[PDB]
Coordinates of C-alpha atoms and ligand atoms in Angstrom, one line a residue:
Chain A
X1 CA -73.2 120.7 6.8
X2 CA -75.7 118.9 9.1
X3 CA -74.3 117.0 12.1
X4 CA -77.0 114.4 12.3
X5 CA -76.2 113.5 8.7
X6 CA -72.5 113.3 9.3
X7 CA -73.2 111.2 12.4
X8 CA -75.4 108.8 10.5
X9 CA -72.7 108.5 7.9
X10 CA -70.0 107.4 10.4
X11 CA -72.4 105.1 12.1
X12 CA -73.2 103.2 8.8
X13 CA -72.3 99.5 9.4
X14 CA -69.9 97.5 7.2
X15 CA -71.2 95.3 4.5
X16 CA -71.4 91.6 5.2
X17 CA -71.2 88.6 2.9
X18 CA -74.0 86.2 2.0
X19 CA -71.6 83.2 1.7
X20 CA -73.9 80.8 -0.2
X21 CA -72.8 77.3 0.5
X22 CA -70.6 76.2 -2.5
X23 CA -71.3 72.5 -1.8
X24 CA -75.1 72.9 -2.1
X25 CA -76.7 72.5 -5.6
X26 CA -78.5 75.6 -6.8
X27 CA -82.3 75.7 -6.1
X28 CA -85.0 77.9 -4.9
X29 CA -84.4 76.5 -1.4
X30 CA -80.7 77.4 -1.4
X31 CA -81.4 80.9 -2.6
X32 CA -84.1 81.5 0.0
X33 CA -82.0 80.0 2.7
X34 CA -79.1 82.2 1.7
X35 CA -81.3 85.3 1.7
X36 CA -83.0 84.6 5.0
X37 CA -79.6 83.7 6.6
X38 CA -78.1 87.0 5.3
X39 CA -81.1 89.0 6.6
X40 CA -80.8 87.4 10.0
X41 CA -77.2 88.6 10.4
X42 CA -78.1 92.0 9.0
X43 CA -80.9 92.3 11.5
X44 CA -78.3 92.0 14.4
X45 CA -76.2 94.7 12.7
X46 CA -79.4 96.9 12.3
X47 CA -80.2 96.7 16.0
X48 CA -76.7 97.9 16.8
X49 CA -76.9 100.7 14.2
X50 CA -80.1 102.1 15.6
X51 CA -78.5 102.8 19.0
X52 CA -76.5 105.5 17.2
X53 CA -79.6 107.4 16.2
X54 CA -80.0 110.5 18.4
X55 CA -82.7 109.8 21.0
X56 CA -83.4 106.2 20.0
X57 CA -81.7 104.5 22.9
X58 CA -83.4 106.8 25.4
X59 CA -86.8 105.4 24.3
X60 CA -87.9 102.5 26.5
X61 CA -86.9 99.0 25.4
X62 CA -90.4 98.1 24.4
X63 CA -90.6 101.2 22.2
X64 CA -87.2 100.5 20.6
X65 CA -88.4 97.0 19.8
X66 CA -91.7 98.2 18.4
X67 CA -90.0 100.5 15.9
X68 CA -87.6 97.8 14.8
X69 CA -90.3 95.2 14.5
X70 CA -92.3 97.6 12.2
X71 CA -89.4 98.8 10.1
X72 CA -87.0 95.9 9.8
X73 CA -87.9 94.9 6.2
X74 CA -88.0 98.5 5.0
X75 CA -84.5 99.0 6.3
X76 CA -83.3 95.8 4.7
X77 CA -84.8 96.6 1.4
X78 CA -83.5 100.2 1.4
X79 CA -80.1 98.6 1.9
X80 CA -80.1 96.4 -1.2
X81 CA -81.7 99.2 -3.2
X82 CA -78.8 101.5 -2.3
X83 CA -76.1 98.8 -3.0
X84 CA -77.8 98.3 -6.5
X85 CA -77.8 101.9 -7.7
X86 CA -74.7 101.5 -10.0
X87 CA -76.0 98.2 -11.5
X88 CA -78.5 97.5 -14.3
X89 CA -81.4 95.1 -13.6
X90 CA -79.4 93.4 -10.8
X91 CA -79.9 93.4 -7.0
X92 CA -76.8 93.5 -4.9
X93 CA -77.9 91.7 -1.8
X94 CA -74.2 91.3 -1.0
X95 CA -70.9 91.7 -2.9
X96 CA -70.9 87.9 -3.3
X97 CA -74.7 87.6 -4.0
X98 CA -75.9 89.6 -7.0
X99 CA -79.3 88.5 -8.4
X100 CA -80.3 88.9 -12.0
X101 CA -83.7 88.4 -13.5
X102 CA -83.2 84.6 -14.2
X103 CA -82.1 84.0 -10.6
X104 CA -85.2 85.9 -9.3
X105 CA -87.5 83.7 -11.4
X106 CA -85.8 80.5 -10.1
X107 CA -86.2 81.7 -6.5
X108 CA -89.8 82.6 -7.0
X109 CA -88.9 86.3 -6.3
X110 CA -89.5 87.8 -9.8
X111 CA -92.4 90.0 -8.8
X112 CA -90.9 91.2 -5.5
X113 CA -87.5 91.9 -7.0
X114 CA -89.1 93.8 -9.9
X115 CA -90.7 96.1 -7.3
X116 CA -87.3 96.6 -5.6
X117 CA -85.9 97.4 -9.0
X118 CA -88.6 100.1 -9.4
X119 CA -87.3 101.7 -6.2
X120 CA -83.8 101.5 -7.7
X121 CA -84.9 103.2 -11.0
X122 CA -86.5 106.1 -9.1
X123 CA -83.5 106.7 -6.9
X124 CA -81.1 106.5 -9.9
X125 CA -82.9 109.3 -11.7
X126 CA -83.0 111.3 -8.5
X127 CA -79.3 110.7 -8.0
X128 CA -79.8 109.5 -4.4
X129 CA -76.7 110.3 -2.3
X130 CA -75.3 108.3 0.6
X131 CA -76.1 111.2 2.9
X132 CA -79.7 111.0 1.8
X133 CA -79.9 107.2 2.0
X134 CA -78.7 107.0 5.6
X135 CA -81.2 109.8 6.6
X136 CA -84.1 108.1 4.9
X137 CA -83.2 104.8 6.6
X138 CA -83.4 106.5 10.0
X139 CA -86.7 108.2 9.1
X140 CA -88.2 104.9 7.9
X141 CA -87.4 103.5 11.3
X142 CA -88.9 106.5 13.2
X143 CA -92.0 106.7 10.9
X144 CA -92.7 103.0 10.9
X145 CA -96.3 103.4 12.3
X146 CA -96.2 100.7 15.0
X147 CA -99.6 100.2 16.7
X148 CA -97.9 99.6 20.0
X149 CA -96.0 102.7 21.0
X150 CA -95.9 103.7 24.6
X151 CA -94.4 107.2 24.4
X152 CA -96.0 108.6 21.3
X153 CA -94.8 112.2 21.9
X154 CA -91.1 111.0 22.2
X155 CA -91.3 108.9 19.0
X156 CA -92.9 111.9 17.2
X157 CA -90.0 114.1 18.5
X158 CA -87.5 111.5 17.0
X159 CA -89.3 111.9 13.7
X160 CA -89.0 115.7 13.8
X161 CA -85.3 115.6 14.6
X162 CA -84.6 113.4 11.6
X163 CA -86.9 115.3 9.3
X164 CA -85.2 118.5 10.3
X165 CA -81.9 117.0 9.4
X166 CA -83.1 116.0 6.0
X167 CA -84.5 119.5 5.4
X168 CA -81.3 121.2 6.6
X169 CA -79.2 118.9 4.4
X170 CA -81.2 119.6 1.2
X171 CA -81.4 123.3 1.9
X172 CA -77.6 123.6 2.0
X173 CA -76.6 121.0 -0.5
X174 CA -79.4 121.2 -3.2
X175 CA -80.3 124.8 -3.6
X176 CA -81.1 124.1 -7.2
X177 CA -84.3 122.2 -6.1
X178 CA -86.0 123.7 -3.1
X179 CA -88.4 120.7 -3.0
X180 CA -85.9 117.9 -3.0
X181 CA -86.5 117.0 0.7
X182 CA -90.2 116.5 -0.1
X183 CA -89.4 114.5 -3.2
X184 CA -87.2 112.2 -1.0
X185 CA -90.1 111.8 1.5
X186 CA -92.5 111.0 -1.4
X187 CA -90.4 107.9 -2.2
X188 CA -91.3 106.3 1.2
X189 CA -94.8 105.0 0.1
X190 CA -93.4 102.7 -2.5
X191 CA -90.8 101.4 0.0
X192 CA -93.6 100.7 2.5
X193 CA -95.7 98.9 -0.2
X194 CA -92.8 96.7 -1.3
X195 CA -91.9 95.9 2.3
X196 CA -95.5 95.0 3.1
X197 CA -95.5 92.5 0.2
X198 CA -92.1 91.1 1.1
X199 CA -93.0 90.4 4.7
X200 CA -96.1 88.6 3.6
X201 CA -94.2 86.6 1.1
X202 CA -91.5 85.4 3.5
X203 CA -94.2 84.8 6.1
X204 CA -95.8 82.4 3.6
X205 CA -92.4 80.8 3.0
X206 CA -92.1 80.4 6.8
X207 CA -95.4 78.6 7.0
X208 CA -94.5 76.2 4.1
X209 CA -91.7 75.0 6.4
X210 CA -89.2 74.1 3.6
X211 CA -86.7 77.0 4.2
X212 CA -84.9 76.9 7.6
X213 CA -84.8 80.3 9.3
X214 CA -82.8 81.5 12.3
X215 CA -84.2 83.0 15.6
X216 CA -84.1 86.7 15.0
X217 CA -85.5 86.6 11.4
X218 CA -88.4 84.4 12.7
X219 CA -89.0 86.8 15.6
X220 CA -89.3 89.7 13.1
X221 CA -91.6 87.7 10.9
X222 CA -93.8 86.7 13.8
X223 CA -94.1 90.1 15.3
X224 CA -95.9 91.2 12.1
Chain B
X1 CA -103.6 131.8 -0.4
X2 CA -102.7 129.1 -2.9
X3 CA -104.9 128.9 -6.1
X4 CA -104.4 125.1 -6.7
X5 CA -105.6 124.5 -3.1
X6 CA -108.6 126.8 -3.7
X7 CA -109.3 125.1 -7.0
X8 CA -109.2 121.6 -5.4
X9 CA -111.6 122.8 -2.7
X10 CA -114.2 123.9 -5.2
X11 CA -113.7 120.8 -7.3
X12 CA -114.5 118.5 -4.3
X13 CA -117.4 116.3 -5.2
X14 CA -120.6 116.0 -3.2
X15 CA -121.0 113.1 -0.7
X16 CA -123.2 110.2 -1.9
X17 CA -125.3 107.8 0.1
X18 CA -124.6 104.1 0.6
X19 CA -128.4 103.2 0.6
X20 CA -128.2 99.8 2.3
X21 CA -131.3 97.8 1.2
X22 CA -133.7 98.0 4.1
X23 CA -135.4 94.8 3.0
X24 CA -132.3 92.6 3.2
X25 CA -131.3 91.0 6.5
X26 CA -128.0 92.1 8.0
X27 CA -125.1 89.9 7.2
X28 CA -121.5 90.1 6.1
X29 CA -122.7 89.7 2.5
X30 CA -125.0 92.7 2.8
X31 CA -122.3 94.9 4.4
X32 CA -119.7 93.9 1.7
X33 CA -122.3 94.4 -1.0
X34 CA -123.2 97.8 0.3
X35 CA -119.6 98.8 0.6
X36 CA -118.5 97.6 -2.9
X37 CA -121.7 99.2 -4.4
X38 CA -120.8 102.5 -2.7
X39 CA -117.2 102.3 -3.9
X40 CA -118.3 101.6 -7.5
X41 CA -120.4 104.8 -7.6
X42 CA -117.6 106.8 -5.8
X43 CA -115.1 105.6 -8.5
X44 CA -117.2 107.2 -11.2
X45 CA -117.2 110.5 -9.2
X46 CA -113.4 110.2 -8.7
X47 CA -112.7 109.9 -12.4
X48 CA -114.7 113.1 -12.9
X49 CA -112.9 114.9 -10.1
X50 CA -109.4 114.1 -11.4
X51 CA -110.1 116.0 -14.6
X52 CA -110.1 119.2 -12.5
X53 CA -106.5 118.6 -11.4
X54 CA -104.2 121.0 -13.3
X55 CA -102.5 119.0 -16.0
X56 CA -104.2 115.7 -15.4
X57 CA -106.5 115.8 -18.5
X58 CA -103.5 116.7 -20.7
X59 CA -101.9 113.4 -20.0
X60 CA -102.7 110.6 -22.5
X61 CA -105.8 108.5 -21.8
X62 CA -103.6 105.5 -21.0
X63 CA -101.6 107.6 -18.4
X64 CA -104.7 109.0 -16.8
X65 CA -106.0 105.4 -16.5
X66 CA -102.7 104.1 -15.1
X67 CA -102.7 106.7 -12.3
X68 CA -106.3 106.0 -11.4
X69 CA -105.8 102.2 -11.5
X70 CA -102.9 102.6 -9.0
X71 CA -104.4 105.1 -6.7
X72 CA -108.2 104.4 -6.6
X73 CA -108.2 102.6 -3.2
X74 CA -105.9 105.2 -1.5
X75 CA -108.3 107.9 -2.7
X76 CA -111.4 106.0 -1.4
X77 CA -109.7 105.3 2.0
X78 CA -108.6 108.9 2.4
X79 CA -112.2 109.9 1.8
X80 CA -113.6 107.8 4.6
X81 CA -110.7 108.8 6.9
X82 CA -111.6 112.5 6.4
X83 CA -115.3 112.0 6.9
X84 CA -114.5 110.2 10.2
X85 CA -112.3 112.9 11.8
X86 CA -115.0 114.2 14.2
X87 CA -116.1 110.7 15.2
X88 CA -114.8 108.3 17.8
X89 CA -113.9 104.7 16.8
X90 CA -116.4 104.8 13.9
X91 CA -115.9 105.0 10.2
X92 CA -118.2 107.3 8.2
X93 CA -118.4 105.5 4.8
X94 CA -121.5 107.6 4.1
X95 CA -123.8 109.7 6.2
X96 CA -126.2 106.7 6.2
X97 CA -123.4 104.1 6.7
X98 CA -121.3 104.6 9.8
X99 CA -119.5 101.4 11.0
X100 CA -118.6 100.8 14.6
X101 CA -116.3 98.0 15.9
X102 CA -119.1 95.4 16.2
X103 CA -120.2 95.9 12.6
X104 CA -116.6 95.6 11.4
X105 CA -116.2 92.3 13.1
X106 CA -119.4 91.0 11.6
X107 CA -118.3 92.1 8.1
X108 CA -114.9 90.5 8.6
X109 CA -113.3 94.0 8.3
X110 CA -112.0 94.4 11.9
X111 CA -108.3 94.4 11.1
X112 CA -108.7 96.6 7.9
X113 CA -110.9 99.1 9.7
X114 CA -108.6 99.2 12.7
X115 CA -105.8 100.4 10.3
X116 CA -108.1 103.0 8.8
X117 CA -108.8 104.1 12.3
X118 CA -105.1 104.5 12.9
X119 CA -104.9 106.9 9.9
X120 CA -107.8 108.8 11.6
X121 CA -106.0 109.0 14.9
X122 CA -102.9 110.5 13.3
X123 CA -104.9 113.1 11.3
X124 CA -106.9 114.1 14.3
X125 CA -103.8 114.9 16.4
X126 CA -102.4 116.8 13.4
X127 CA -105.7 118.7 13.1
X128 CA -105.9 117.8 9.3
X129 CA -107.7 120.6 7.4
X130 CA -109.9 120.2 4.4
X131 CA -107.4 122.2 2.4
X132 CA -104.7 119.7 3.3
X133 CA -107.0 116.7 2.7
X134 CA -107.8 117.6 -0.9
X135 CA -104.2 118.4 -1.7
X136 CA -103.0 115.0 -0.3
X137 CA -105.7 113.3 -2.3
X138 CA -104.3 114.8 -5.5
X139 CA -100.7 114.0 -4.5
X140 CA -101.7 110.4 -3.8
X141 CA -103.1 110.2 -7.3
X142 CA -100.0 111.7 -8.9
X143 CA -97.5 109.7 -6.7
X144 CA -99.2 106.3 -7.1
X145 CA -96.1 104.6 -8.6
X146 CA -97.8 102.9 -11.6
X147 CA -95.4 100.6 -13.4
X148 CA -96.9 101.5 -16.8
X149 CA -96.5 105.2 -17.3
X150 CA -95.7 106.4 -20.8
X151 CA -94.8 110.1 -20.2
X152 CA -92.7 109.8 -17.0
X153 CA -91.5 113.4 -17.1
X154 CA -95.1 114.8 -17.4
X155 CA -96.3 112.7 -14.4
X156 CA -93.3 113.9 -12.4
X157 CA -94.2 117.5 -13.3
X158 CA -97.7 116.9 -12.1
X159 CA -96.2 115.7 -8.8
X160 CA -94.1 118.8 -8.5
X161 CA -97.0 121.2 -9.2
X162 CA -99.1 119.6 -6.4
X163 CA -96.1 119.3 -3.9
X164 CA -95.4 123.0 -4.5
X165 CA -99.0 123.8 -3.7
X166 CA -98.8 121.9 -0.4
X167 CA -95.5 123.7 0.4
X168 CA -97.0 127.1 -0.4
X169 CA -100.1 126.4 1.6
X170 CA -98.3 125.4 4.7
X171 CA -95.7 128.2 4.5
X172 CA -98.5 130.8 4.5
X173 CA -101.0 129.1 6.8
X174 CA -98.8 127.3 9.4
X175 CA -95.9 129.5 10.1
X176 CA -95.8 128.0 13.6
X177 CA -94.5 124.6 12.2
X178 CA -92.1 125.1 9.3
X179 CA -92.1 121.3 8.8
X180 CA -95.8 120.7 8.6
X181 CA -95.7 120.0 4.8
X182 CA -93.2 117.2 5.4
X183 CA -95.2 115.8 8.3
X184 CA -98.2 115.6 5.9
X185 CA -96.1 113.8 3.3
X186 CA -94.9 111.4 6.0
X187 CA -98.5 110.2 6.5
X188 CA -98.6 108.8 2.9
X189 CA -96.8 105.5 3.7
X190 CA -99.4 104.3 6.2
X191 CA -102.1 105.2 3.6
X192 CA -100.3 103.2 1.0
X193 CA -99.9 100.2 3.4
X194 CA -103.5 100.2 4.3
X195 CA -104.7 100.5 0.7
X196 CA -102.4 97.6 -0.3
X197 CA -104.0 95.4 2.3
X198 CA -107.5 96.5 1.4
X199 CA -107.1 95.8 -2.3
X200 CA -105.8 92.3 -1.6
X201 CA -108.7 91.7 0.8
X202 CA -111.4 92.7 -1.6
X203 CA -109.6 90.8 -4.4
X204 CA -109.9 87.7 -2.3
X205 CA -113.6 88.5 -1.7
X206 CA -114.0 88.8 -5.5
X207 CA -112.5 85.4 -6.0
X208 CA -114.8 83.8 -3.4
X209 CA -117.7 84.9 -5.6
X210 CA -120.3 85.4 -2.9
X211 CA -120.4 89.3 -3.1
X212 CA -121.7 90.7 -6.4
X213 CA -119.6 93.6 -7.7
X214 CA -120.3 96.1 -10.5
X215 CA -118.2 96.7 -13.6
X216 CA -115.9 99.6 -12.6
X217 CA -115.1 98.2 -9.2
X218 CA -114.2 94.9 -10.8
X219 CA -112.1 96.7 -13.4
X220 CA -110.1 98.5 -10.7
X221 CA -109.6 95.2 -8.8
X222 CA -108.4 93.4 -11.9
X223 CA -106.0 96.0 -13.0
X224 CA -104.0 95.4 -9.7
Ligands
LIG301 C1 -85.5 89.5 3.2 C2 -84.6 89.4 2.0 C3 -85.4 89.7 0.8 C4 -85.0 89.1 -0.4 C5 -85.7 89.4 -1.5 C6 -86.8 90.2 -1.5 O1 -87.5 90.4 -2.7 C7 -87.2 90.8 -0.3 C8 -86.5 90.5 0.8 C9 -83.5 90.3 2.1 C10 -82.4 89.8 2.7 C11 -81.2 90.7 2.8 C12 -81.3 92.0 2.5 O2 -80.2 92.8 2.6 C13 -82.5 92.5 1.9 C14 -83.6 91.7 1.8
LIG302 C1 -113.6 99.6 -0.7 C2 -114.3 100.0 0.6 C3 -113.6 99.6 1.7 C4 -114.4 99.3 2.9 C5 -113.7 98.9 4.0 C6 -112.3 98.8 4.0 O1 -111.7 98.4 5.2 C7 -111.6 99.1 2.9 C8 -112.2 99.5 1.8 C9 -114.6 101.4 0.6 C10 -115.8 101.8 0.0 C11 -116.2 103.1 0.0 C12 -115.3 104.1 0.5 O2 -115.7 105.4 0.5 C13 -114.1 103.7 1.0 C14 -113.7 102.3 1.1

């Protein structure tokens, strides 16, 4: 089928471990530290992945940064959503960090994780494929609505290249549902809503000053 | 062309006036009172409009209410966006209530209105048509992601009926851009983001207790 889709598949990064500190007693502070630490190392891996997206690295450095600073949380959330598709009421942040409802309550994340679980429920019934996940991830990046884009036309062309790939993939692979591509695009609003709430939540955590955060994660929180 | 699109066009409600009280001195409280008063009367008109959407009134009353309680602010915002397309850096809440940048600052709405203006900018370059506006309004309602839907399959069928109409309209009317339907769907995330921020903002205003609000507007704020 589609080459952009095959290319995004081979560019998909390897999963990384959360590695919660086994010597630290369980608390909300430990869980939030673990999660922000994981997100920080995933953000490095995300920056490297985006350079494989056709056309992304030919944008100016400021434009590459604007897109990432708008989309980082959507990309992170789509990741845990996809890793969670075969589970039931659990969120697979990492193979060694799977959160159930009780752990979400203790971390103060019950409402945010419930919204992530709603994204999971929708993608399960739609039988979301890996091919579709990596394409939506790239589209989320290109369609992130940064207020600060220099070359608007070039960003809009990146959006069109990825949308075409999604259309081409669905036309060849899902002839039983000629509207599957649009259904996939219609999942993006709930992803944007959940990411908007998540960024504000962790920005509040940053202001309370009880959870240490690393440099890149703080940079992504401050850009917003 | 498409009958659903023609039907939504004739079902479009008449514009109403904001009628700011000419005896009241200008303040943030007056502007916010005017805006919430307008929104309250528009919400009544929106409930009546939705009964014209094919299939909507055959949903149970609880399901009709769930969709409206999720989408009300998106529908309101899409309205002012569309009324503003021929203007420059101004938001046409009503023919007698057009807000420029200075008035937004004084009302404490500078950041929210700037995001609404970003929606306007995108739809201007895309040359959004009235046919496309009324269809996206209906799709926003059907795709509002309520957590409380009883008949999930029936809501999903409503989504498919409206998506089909958008696809059919664009295929016949915009043969020069075979991906215009998807481009239109890809504007929905920024609309959902802006509405999420707007609801939280006016919920905070409700808690401060200095701006009187009417019954329906309060009901829509409390459901969230
Ligand atoms: C930012 C963090 C997060 C945790 C719980 C939320 O409800 C929202 C966000 C996170 C970390 C690593 C990921 O792979 C994905 C998300
Ligand atoms: C809720 C109110 C509003 C004002 C300013 C905002 O930035 C966001 C929302 C509003 C009232 C009437 C409308 O037709 C549309 C919106």
